[PDB]
Symmetry: D4
């Protein structure tokens, strides 16, 4: 909405644990107006939720695999059911319908190659797909849930 | 650590706003032991942080671009500086060193093609790269920050 | 036909608004012979039509997408109907049957990625196609309707 | 601007030869208001120009080649000069800076393969380019200079 | 067979018009032994035939197209009939069953792109093929019917 | 030139061994006019030469390899010298400057993979080339030196 | 198991012909404890077998071909039978289910291209496969059956 | 050499542990002639060595990676040193100079993705390579050191 909302969101995306009175002080605001701004943004759905982010090394999901899918020609309903069943897998953490050479791109997290192999077998039992090409990440250099706020309007 | 820690984490990854006494009740625990478990997991870094997640449509970052990079042969220090300068861009929300045909995979968020074009010009002024191939997402079907907890050990 | 016809066409391809008497003077001709040359070229179909060209930024069609299609094996009649239904789309501004890896190449104009996504859904409801690979233009550096006239014979 | 402007433009893109009084009647308007609308659209640059379109078979430019270019890493000024020198070629009728695997896409028109070969030699004397991949069209199924007007706003 | 046979063949592959007595002198042989060597090589089929070679520019077949074919899975009999019907086309001057990404490679000669287009339509009416990718030669730098004779044994 | 010349050429491309009097009878001509037609076609270079064609299995050159080359950017003189040195190799029986993904296509004949390996080492000592991709033929289904004569004009 | 087991295995992987008393001396052990360690490793299956390794040049299997296979979508049982029938071929010396663009990778040994061609025909009679791409090795630079022992644990 | 040598080798490739007297009985031979045949084959190098084969799961090298390398143009000596330094790595168990799109193919064994990542860093410190594309095996379906003996001659 305005520049003060942006200052609030910039901190909230980094850390939602601050007492609302300490966030207020960090953004140059009294407590009530700060709280009221946050409430409006929650109601409007700008802030969609607040979550704990876990360490993938510590919950044993340290490998990222990017799975590239090509589909055959299919009805709007088949695509709706294909994307519902891929979405149910807890290991599929991101799922995109792409343009370009590939139809869908998934990001999958698992502890190791063998865990990936067994995930893939469960996936492929439930769907049918012309071509799957999996690519394993060697390192996660950056992963953030912070959006760029320079474009807000 | 144990199965009760998993029940706690499963809720925390979905919603970190609950009062600790209400989370306790949802996991079958008294309040203090629940709190003490959460504290241990924070100290140990299993829980790395708690954050607000924003709606990309509402902060004007609705387009996702997957940028595939190939590099020339370079020193361990060049790769260290290349990955530091790509990491600074607020639009680069995910950044992986890959195995396979592509050296690096970025996920970039922007409002539109023109915003992507201008991001790309800023990136390429700061780095040098044999080949960049960008692919635009048509739809984000799933995006979650919840890790699968079935592998915890 | 001859070199004076070429001088006439070179101007007409740039600007068809000139009074025929001013075009005559610009090509070194009296008015009637100039007019008579233009008439012959219209009758013969060398000049096929005269049109207004609009600014794509101002009519909200600023994104160009090049859509690469591969088809299955099909009858001469299926190809005739496939190309008739793709041709009806007002967004398909150019459409070629190609040689090489790709069977067909389309140029599509739309305001944005979302408009492209919805165009693609309408297209794909009406046709069936093994593989579509879309590539978005970052910039239109040159677009002219002027043909090279150095080869005329 | 409004729906009557759209009706005017829809005809103008098809045929700019009509007397303004006959266009008026076709769009449900008196002559002066029709003329005044057209003038505004010219002044504003919505209508950028009016041109004769020629028959490529009759001016001996019947072959279309789509030329895909990849460049090395280069300064913003090199790209500015590269695109100025490619733009000067009368055979390069369309020229795009692309996203995806290819850096630039050209559409080139010539009478035959040999004319293409000689064009290519002239181009490559003047520029330096990692990779050029040319693809010849077998047929031009549709070519229009009419933009879709459904998106106007 | 021996080194004198090789000297004979080296000339015969270049020019079969010489009187047998002049070939004899050029290879250091009397006429009868030279003739008798040539006869043996014809009978044994080392020399398979003698032919006129024509100038492709002068018989209006100046364009070479290399056609890469991929087939579906098929019976040994389907492949036998597919290769018999492709072989009948007078424009298919060379035809290979390949290893690697492509199943078959053809060399086709025609006067121009349009002649190629019409050849392709006739071919594809008679066969069914997953993928055809045609590539046009810009120049024939070397074409010889002379085999290397350094390996003879 | 005319249809009788075509009848003559159709036989000559198959077999140049016939006495001119027997060819005459096969084409419906007296001997002298037949001879005179053949002479004209030789003088004009329509018939470029007459050669013995040998059996590749019998001269120990039974393997065909198609070698795909990509070059860097180079002067018109470098390309002239590159193509002169590749042309000298007796194993390079066909050599084309291509359009498309590949810059040059060679057809190479050798007895076996090891002979190919040693040819490749000699070639690469003498030239420098970004990318060579070799593909081995499994079978030569058709190889003819007969051009299609349906296009003659 | 421990570092002395590693010293034993490092020699055994190189040469299993030594009398157990000479191996003992080479690893710093008395004979019985050395023997007892070897027995334990056989019983546990760390040592799976001892074999003669033959020279491929001397048994006429000097060509290596890497065969890349893509399959259609198939049941867990079809994949089980496909992999059983490919496994029976004595020429298929290594066989992997891959991730990435290719579904399976085989290493095949034969004397020559023709032997490969005939192997391929036998394979393809028994299985059905969307795409096979074969690549021939020019040289075997290293081939060892020794595993790296630095990771043992 | 002969069919009895083949019977001996067929067993030796499977199991070299048999007492020579028991192998003799299995091949239909008295002991001395069997021994003498084996000695000849060792002296001639048909049998190159006898080795223990270990279980990759039990020595913690359970992941196979196929590493595809492309090199720049280089001297015969650079290629000699490149292949010597890649050969020294104990994890590179197979190493081939290839024909086709890829210059070299390696088979690498490691316990996991992280071990592969660290191997790759050591390799790339010691060599310079245009392009490396790694592909991870999901399963080793067959791995044998037995050559096909049907081609022996
Ligand atoms: Ca796959
Ligand atoms: Ca690009
Ligand atoms: Ca697509
Ligand atoms: Ca090219
Ligand atoms: Ca095609
Ligand atoms: Ca190569
Ligand atoms: Ca193949
Ligand atoms: Ca790589
Ligand atoms: Cl949400
Ligand atoms: Cl919330
Ligand atoms: Cl697409
Ligand atoms: Cl929170
Ligand atoms: Cl963190
Ligand atoms: Cl926290
Ligand atoms: Cl890699
Ligand atoms: Cl957009
Ligand atoms: Cl006009
Ligand atoms: Cl028209
Ligand atoms: Cl007109
Ligand atoms: Cl084609
Ligand atoms: Cl303009
Ligand atoms: Cl105008
Ligand atoms: Cl890009
Ligand atoms: Cl042409
Ligand atoms: Cl023959
Ligand atoms: Cl003959
Ligand atoms: Cl193959
Ligand atoms: Cl002759
Ligand atoms: Cl000649
Ligand atoms: Cl001649
Ligand atoms: Cl090209
Ligand atoms: Cl071979
Ligand atoms: Cl075993
Ligand atoms: Cl054993
Ligand atoms: Cl995969
Ligand atoms: Cl042994
Ligand atoms: Cl050895
Ligand atoms: Cl031995
Ligand atoms: Cl190669
Ligand atoms: Cl792993």
């Amino acid at each position: 909405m305005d520049r003060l909302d942006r200052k609030i969101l910039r901190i909230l995306q980094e850390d939602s644990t601050l007492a609302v009175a300490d966030l207020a002080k960090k953004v140059g605001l009294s407590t009530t107006p700060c709280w009221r701004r946050i409430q409006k943004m929650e109601e409007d759905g700008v802030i969609r939720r607040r979550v704990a982010l876990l360490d993938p090394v510590k919950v044993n999901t340290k490998v990222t695999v990017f799975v590239s899918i090509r589909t055959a020609s299919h009805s709007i309903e088949w695509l709706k059911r294909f994307s519902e069943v891929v979405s149910e897998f807890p290991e599929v953490v991101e799922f995109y319908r792409m343009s370009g050479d590939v139809d869908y791109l998934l990001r999958v997290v698992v502890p190791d190659i063998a865990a990936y192999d067994a995930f893939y077998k469960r996936m492929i039992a439930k769907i049918e797909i012309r071509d799957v090409s999996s690519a394993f990440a060697m390192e996660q250099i950056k992963y953030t849930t912070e959006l760029p706020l320079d474009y807000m309007l």
